[PDB]
Amino acid sequence: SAVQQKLAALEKSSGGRLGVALIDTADNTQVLYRGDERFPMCSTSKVMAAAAVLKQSETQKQLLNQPVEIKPADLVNYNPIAEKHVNGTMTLAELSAAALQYSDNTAMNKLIAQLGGPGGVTAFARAIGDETFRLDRWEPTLNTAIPGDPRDTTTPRAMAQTLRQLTLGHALGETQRAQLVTWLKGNTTGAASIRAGLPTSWTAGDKTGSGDYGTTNDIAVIWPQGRAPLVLVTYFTQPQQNAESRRDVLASAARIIAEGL
């Protein structure tokens, strides 16, 4: 197909390995490129952690408004929001928003702690039928992205299915689904990634990721006009440990997909 040829050429030009999964909710059809190969998730795993906390909140009503102390020991390598509140508190809702919309790594570790460790995030994934997702480590070491290492990876097919379930399906309660979608739509980190390759009139919510080996990821839910919503995930990783992340490769993959719609 034209999409596959274009994705392979993009992959060659970029020097890396690209994975793409598109789900069209009109007919549940999928377009896949390396759909069943594992890729490091990096910050895309924050969606699962936030969703798991939302799920806890369905029976623990005021959980989202619970204050959590932010301590110096909590800070890691990228803390744009958390560093502003050190020695104060943030609520779990605020931590979820920081994680999702700013990719705050301290905020992620606070969510992981709220869930009882990395295993708590993975247990939620299993509870919503994702047998592929695995979170093995905390921030920042979950970003090592070593080729062939299955730790902290998923597949494009698996993550597209899961994002669909969380944002358009019934993995969460109605109020919680709406809250996750609201957070994703307010993301600040994704302008150069999938968003840059979509028509501006199509609304999207997304979560990016980046890490070692020039790993560059984005997962999005998209509301085009003229048709049912779509889910698009784009995962990218490179052979050299010190390769720079390439948000523009994800934009190009999104353009290729949008061409084939």
186 DSSP assignment: T
Taking the complex as a whole, the smallest distance from the CB of residue 145 to Cl ion amounts, in Å, to 4
C-alpha to C-alpha distance for 169 and 55, rounded to whole angstroms: 14
Residue 53 near residue 111 (C-beta atoms within 8 A) = yes
Taking the complex as a whole, the smallest distance from the CB of residue 41 to Cl ion amounts, in Å, to 7
Check residue 144 for interaction with Cl ion (CB under 5 A).
Answer: yes
| Residue of 43, 103, 245, 252 marked active site | 43
Specify the stretch interacting with Cl ion by CB under 5 A; choose among 51-59, 105-113, 145-153, 237-245. Answer: 145-153
- Report the residue number whose CB is nearest to Cl ion: 40
Taking the complex as a whole, the smallest distance from the CB of residue 215 to Cl ion amounts, in Å, to 7
C-alpha to C-alpha distance for 154 and 261, rounded to whole angstroms: 25
C-alpha to C-alpha distance for 107 and 187, rounded to whole angstroms: 15
Known catalytic membership, residue 43: yes
Residue 75 near residue 86 (C-beta atoms within 8 A) = yes
Check residue 145 for interaction with Cl ion (CB under 5 A).
Answer: yes
- Here the tokens at position 224 are 């085009």
Give the three-class secondary structure for 214: coil
Window 23-62: residues binding Cl ion (CB under 5 A):
40
Residue 209 or 229: the one with the smaller Cβ distance to Cl ion is 209
Report the 10 Å Cβ neighbour count for 66.
15
Taking the complex as a whole, the smallest distance from the CB of residue 137 to Cl ion amounts, in Å, to 8
C-alpha to C-alpha distance for 47 and 40, rounded to whole angstroms: 14
Tokens 């509301």 -> residue: 223
Residue 92 or 145: the one with the smaller Cβ distance to Cl ion is 145
Check residue 152 for interaction with Cl ion (CB under 5 A).
Answer: yes
Residue 139 or 152: the one with the smaller Cβ distance to Cl ion is 152
Q: Rule CB under 5 A: which residues touch Cl ion?
A: 40, 144-145, 152
Just list the catalytic residues.
Answer: 43
